[PDB]
Write an enzyme that holds these catalytic residues in place. Structure first.
Site, PDB file in Angstrom:
ATOM      1  N   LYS A 128       0.809  -1.225   0.000  1.00 11.59           N
ATOM      2  CA  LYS A 128       0.000   0.000   0.000  1.00 11.59           C
ATOM      3  C   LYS A 128       0.851   1.288   0.000  1.00 11.59           C
ATOM      4  CE  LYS A 128      -4.439  -1.385   2.165  1.00 11.59           C
ATOM      5  NZ  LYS A 128      -4.693  -2.542   1.319  1.00 11.59           N
ATOM      6  N   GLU A 154     -10.000   6.618   3.449  1.00  9.49           N
ATOM      7  CA  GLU A 154     -10.853   5.530   3.886  1.00  9.49           C
ATOM      8  C   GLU A 154     -10.012   4.310   4.277  1.00  9.49           C
ATOM      9  OE1 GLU A 154     -10.286   4.975   0.545  1.00  9.49           O
ATOM     10  OE2 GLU A 154     -10.311   2.800   0.514  1.00  9.49           O
ATOM     11  N   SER A 201       2.155  -9.614  -0.530  1.00 11.57           N
ATOM     12  CA  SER A 201       1.761  -8.216  -0.351  1.00 11.57           C
ATOM     13  C   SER A 201       1.979  -7.576   1.015  1.00 11.57           C
ATOM     14  CB  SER A 201       0.315  -8.012  -0.814  1.00 11.57           C
ATOM     15  OG  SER A 201      -0.569  -8.877  -0.125  1.00 11.57           O
TER      16      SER A 201
HETATM   17  C1  PLP Z   1      -4.198  -3.721   1.942  1.00 10.42           C
HETATM   18  C2  PLP Z   1      -4.152  -5.157   1.670  1.00 10.42           C
HETATM   19  C3  PLP Z   1      -4.646  -6.018   0.673  1.00 10.42           C
HETATM   20  C4  PLP Z   1      -6.025  -5.752  -0.017  1.00 10.42           C
HETATM   21  O1  PLP Z   1      -5.654  -5.377  -1.245  1.00 10.42           O
HETATM   22  P1  PLP Z   1      -5.665  -4.833  -2.636  1.00 10.42           P
HETATM   23  O2  PLP Z   1      -4.272  -4.993  -3.036  1.00 10.42           O
HETATM   24  O3  PLP Z   1      -5.988  -3.459  -3.077  1.00 10.42           O
HETATM   25  O4  PLP Z   1      -6.496  -5.834  -3.286  1.00 10.42           O
HETATM   26  C5  PLP Z   1      -4.003  -7.178   0.332  1.00 10.42           C
HETATM   27  N1  PLP Z   1      -2.861  -7.577   0.965  1.00 10.42           N
HETATM   28  C6  PLP Z   1      -2.335  -6.805   1.982  1.00 10.42           C
HETATM   29  C7  PLP Z   1      -1.108  -7.225   2.728  1.00 10.42           C
HETATM   30  C8  PLP Z   1      -2.991  -5.621   2.310  1.00 10.42           C
HETATM   31  O5  PLP Z   1      -2.472  -4.828   3.342  1.00 10.42           O
END
Ligand code: PLP
Ligand code: HSP
Ligand code: HSP
Ligand code: PLP
Ligand code: NA
Ligand code: NA
EC number: 4.2.1.20
Lengths: 387, 264, 387, 264
Positions: free
Chosen positions: C85, C107, C375
């Site tokens: 993010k 948000e 992610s």
């Molecule tokens: C914020 C969040 C998501 C939700 O994600 P999008 O990438 O916009 O689909 C997914 N993985 C992590 C680690 C997140 O913090």
């Protein structure tokens, strides 16, 4: 021994006779490994591709606004695990493997070294045993759970004060009877030789990287590098490559707790008494009778009751200077970095920041190029600074 | 010359030495003084006494608790030397050895600690966390005050170590029968070491660690050792009988009489 | 508009007339910025020296032992903040600044976007306002506290279901009356144009870096890149640079919750119905009447009730394939990575891992070169997987 | 042709239109039907009716709660069309406009929604989250079923927008007096827009947002607008008198009579 076990008057190998061959074995393995390009390439690969090396050197513009100080932070908070400890444990794990060892013994207070040892063992296929004082385990369920999730066996020690001191005791007791199959992964740049030397060499990247980075960005070496001192590993990792650069000041910060004058602190190097304990001759938190005492600090990770022998030595000859910072002083630095730089620092690291902040604030017109070693992430401390 | 005399005496009697261990001040000073007199009366040839330390890293649970119990009573190293002086005033010839950790002897200055031992009548000092490599200052100070510096000979000692231990030590050579820490929990052949030490004219060997039964002391004597040390087996009797001091002494008597008989 | 607002049938600009000039302003600023080497150099500097870019590409040897699958993990868990993010918010903050804006509206559901927006604003001197449903604030005190420590104003929304949906509502309500001084930092690759395009372009580093890294280490492009899909940002960031490499499979993983068949899931793309909401035409969690519903998942961060329009499009033409993974399936992947690789993954990321694990386990003899986008960090989820 | 006829009639009378807003089903179906009859009897010239939506992003707290209260009663879009049919069966000439959010009209197919509006006797539809840029399909479907597509003219509309709104809209042009969301909370000169719209032969303008007092409706008429819309001021009377349905109706009567008088 192949290497000098002492840094002037400090250091040594004060362990029961039974453990001497284990220390001589480790030393030889380390000397060999250091000469082995294959070991070196393996260590470099894990550091780069698994841990996230090299870490960033971040300039803090907001914090220094209105003064003649330029501050940079060595980002060890961005290392896998969230602390500098990870560098160390990867090298020690490869050393254990080079020795044909399949088990790892480890001590932990706040939980960080335990988490780091548990992750290195999971990755490198070693069976990890961790000792933690019963008081610390109660106070550290998140880290105990992390260690367990990572496959490590966590063992509470109820002896003595049931804290770090006692965990350190149990680990050596275990090691004296299992050294043939297990390696003791000591968590700081202290203890019997060759540990102070080994941990430094496996933490050296920090200052080496900081040098290249500052030379690139400023075309000059720093006026001073600052680091907190619990046991001494992150500090010596930062200092090492700059020791021969005489113009670069080396400042180590010990926890002052509620204030030196209250007796409630964790600053043995500047306010304790030289003793012999933990396989080492070094300054120590001690009663007048010579009974070992506990270190106190708002930061759980700065609770090692003694300090690395190299620091005691660097201090005695005047190469490095050591100071202290109180709980409130560290809380303020923590708060400040969050609001002005968007970085949440470990309360341990906040003691180093608090000192660079004093250096700035006290003499705003002094031109100063400073580097603080942000040894870790502070997500860990949100609840503590909350209450 | 207490150990020297004792060994010559046991040799003349073709006997092995039985040496019990206890922590000074466990469970209290008066009860401890009482335990020690019982130990001697039941047949102990010499004594190995530990002074309460906060971090006994060479000791298993049993002895770890002995230190804790002494601490609970409030025993301090100063009170220990007072205890030691009286034990000698009562028993003129029994060899007395102290089990120490390094910080307690370095604390007030190494030389001053050995001076105090002499003044009180202590015969030897074993510092559990000081290997031969780090022994110079302790060795020198002990010798200067007519105190025997005790060295530990691991069950896996190489020739260089044996030669070192033989040259440096005095009083007795501490023959470790096992790797690990103190404890009657684990038992764990020393013929080669015993012969090699004899070759190098080392001080008579006393086997220590895991010795808890009479067959164990006879075996030690048979192997060539001059005697055996027993600690956890002794301390366990104290632990067991805390609520009955009278029962404690009586039980301690039977055990050391049995243990001593096995060395004959 | 200067750019196409649609990806086939999906996308658009479904906002009240009053907000149209704000969207046209943002689009122009983005087009300019993208052409501006100065903006580009500024973004690159923050990414490198502040966030920790480039992130590592880690090979997972232990996890794939005994199969013909080679697995690598793009380490976004090592980025400052612990999640991908951060990339996004830094670019959007510079865009706000380029527009002469001094306020930031944001948000957040699970709290991550709020933390990221709060840190970017602290660093870049912007006044940050954050909306969070009252249910989420109660359930997310650690992140609320982090946001506050970072200087951000946190505002609980009690309307509707008092969750993400409703926070998204309040943000636009605020923006419709303050667009002249404030910029709305939307948290995912969804919402009205130009947001889906902007977030992708500011998340593109991920796949671009993954390409170079895999080419270096394997001398080949991956057989498939896998990513979880909450709203779509981390996924599209990974996919983008590989879209024109037709041999590279693109797999997006949606949360299956307790199971698709139970109705308790968060998979609108493959199991919802196309609707018009959140300024967008896209698949949505909806009742038969057209009333907007909530997404369910063990992972709080995968609770956006819809999905990015580019994903819906990539799916319709067959370029990318989307699947789902249940709570238990994700728990298992989480547990497995901890024990075998020493890495604690976010439960969000664990859905992507769980799918690569299925791909392996189901056909162990298939030669496969896979890349999972990790992610985020999972320290956050230790308590959840604990109970 | 209901709006067309109404405006010609008010023009002949040199009067402005007073148009109240309420959410269908708030606080219940029977009470809502009752509220609407009272509104008309007290002098409402036309009606703006909102169908309960889960995510009303163009509405402030007052109307947000109206939707919540209708939801609590269990009102569904199907029940709304039933309500709408009866309102028309009772009142043949009053113009009826629906306030809709996009998902509710797209949900079952755009064309089918407008077909239903026709069948029930609805006169116009305003979709709050569909700008002119995205209006084509809604516009076309509305026109095909003799429903007036209502467009919003922001207080800061440029010439291109004014020209677009004038060309596309029918029934009435929604003149926004303010930026932001619905709410009697904030009040917030439209002479230029009103004149420009007239120039482009736009449908008569009705001013909406923040209108809560009689002076506000007279001012709207004076500026050149054909009338004014009032929502939150109306819904607040319902909210206030929930525990007394009788009190509610009586209070609603006084307010719309006062409001209507100001347009004369
Ligand atoms: C914020 C969040 C998501 C939700 O994600 P999008 O990438 O916009 O689909 C997914 N993985 C992590 C680690 C997140 O913090
Ligand atoms: O010789 S003393 C007491 C030894 C007891 C041995 P055990 O019978 O309980 O098994 C001693 C020597 C070395 C290290 C620690 C010590 O306490
Ligand atoms: O015209 S309806 C009701 C308007 C009420 C305005 P106010 O008097 O409460 O301030 C409407 C139009 C556009 C967007 C949302 C809506 O609900
Ligand atoms: C582990 C720990 C320390 C204590 O450190 P030493 O470096 O060995 O003195 C300091 N900072 C952080 C972040 C730590 O985790
Ligand atoms: Na310390
Ligand atoms: Na989703």
């Amino acid at each position: 021994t192949l290497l000098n076990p002492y840094f002037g008057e400090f250091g040594g190998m004060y362990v029961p006779q039974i453990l001497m061959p284990a220390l001589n074995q480790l030393e030889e393995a380390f000397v060999r490994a250091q000469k082995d390009p294959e070991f070196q390439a393996q260590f470099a690969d894990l550091l780069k591709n698994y841990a996230g090396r090299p870490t960033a050197l971040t300039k803090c513009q907001n914090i220094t606004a209105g003064t003649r100080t330029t501050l940079y932070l060595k980002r060890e908070d961005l290392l896998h695990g969230g602390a500098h400890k990870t560098n160390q444990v990867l090298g020690q794990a490869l050393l254990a493997k080079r020795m044909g060892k399949s088990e790892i013994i480890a001590e932990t207070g706040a939980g960080q070294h335990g988490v780091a040892s548990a992750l290195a063992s999971a990755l490198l296929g070693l069976k990890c045993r961790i000792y933690m004082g019963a008081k610390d385990v109660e106070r550290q369920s998140p880290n105990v759970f992390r260690m367990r999730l990572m496959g490590a066996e966590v063992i509470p020690v109820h002896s003595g004060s049931a804290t770090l001191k006692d965990a350190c005791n149990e680990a050596l007791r275990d090691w004296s009877g299992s050294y043939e199959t297990a390696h003791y992964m000591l968590g700081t740049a202290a203890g019997p030789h060759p540990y102070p030397t080994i941990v430094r060499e496996f933490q050296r990247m920090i200052g080496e990287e900081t040098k290249a980075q500052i030379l690139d960005k400023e075309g000059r070496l720093p006026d001073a590098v600052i680091a907190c001192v619990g046991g001494g590993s992150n500090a010596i990792g930062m200092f090492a490559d700059f020791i021969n650069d005489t113009s670069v000041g080396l400042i180590g910060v010990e926890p002052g707790g509620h204030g030196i004058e209250t007796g409630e602190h964790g600053a043995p190097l500047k306010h304790g008494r030289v003793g012999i304990y933990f396989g080492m001759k070094a300054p120590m938190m001690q009663t007048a009778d010579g009974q070992i005492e506990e270190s106190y600090s708002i930061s759980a990770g700065l609770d090692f009751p003694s300090v690395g022998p190299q620091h005691a030595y660097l201090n005695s000859i005047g190469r490095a200077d050591y100071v202290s910072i109180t709980d409130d002083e560290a809380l303020e630095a923590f708060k400040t970095l969050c609001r002005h730089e968007g970085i949440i620092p470990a309360l341990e690291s906040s003691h180093a920041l608090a000192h660079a902040l004093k250096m700035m604030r006290e003499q705003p017109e002094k031109e100063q190029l400073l580097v603080v070693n942000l040894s870790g992430r502070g997500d860990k401390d949100i609840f503590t600074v909350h209450d | 010359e207490r150990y020297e005399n004792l060994f010559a005496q046991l040799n003349d009697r073709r006997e092995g030495a039985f040496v019990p261990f206890v922590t000074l001040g466990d469970p209290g000073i008066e009860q401890s003084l009482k335990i020690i007199d019982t130990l001697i009366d039941a047949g102990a040839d010499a004594l190995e006494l530990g002074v309460p330390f906060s971090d006994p890293l060479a000791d298993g649970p049993t002895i770890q608790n002995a230190n804790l119990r002494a601490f609970a009573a409030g025993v301090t190293p100063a009170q220990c030397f007072e205890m030691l002086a009286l034990i000698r005033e009562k028993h003129p010839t029994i060899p007395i050895g102290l089990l120490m950790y390094a910080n307690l002897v370095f604390n007030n200055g190494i030389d001053a600690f050995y001076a105090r031992c002499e003044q009180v009548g202590v015969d030897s000092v074993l510092v559990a966390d000081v290997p031969v490599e780090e022994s110079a200052p302790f060795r020198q100070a002990a010798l200067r005050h007519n105190i025997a510096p005790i060295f530990i000979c691991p069950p896996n000692a190489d020739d260089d170590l044996l030669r070192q231990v033989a040259s440096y030590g005095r009083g007795y050579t501490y023959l470790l029968s096992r790797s690990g820490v103190t404890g009657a929990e684990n038992r764990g052949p020393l013929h080669h070491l015993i012969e090699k030490l004899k070759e190098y004219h080392a001080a008579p060997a006393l086997q220590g660690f895991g010795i808890s039964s009479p067959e164990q002391v006879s075996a030690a004597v048979r192997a060539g050792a001059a005697g055996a040390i027993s600690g956890s087996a002794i301390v366990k009797i104290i632990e067991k009988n805390l609520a009955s001091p009278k029962q404690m002494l009586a039980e301690l008597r039977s055990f050391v009489s049995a243990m001593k008989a096995a060395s004959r």
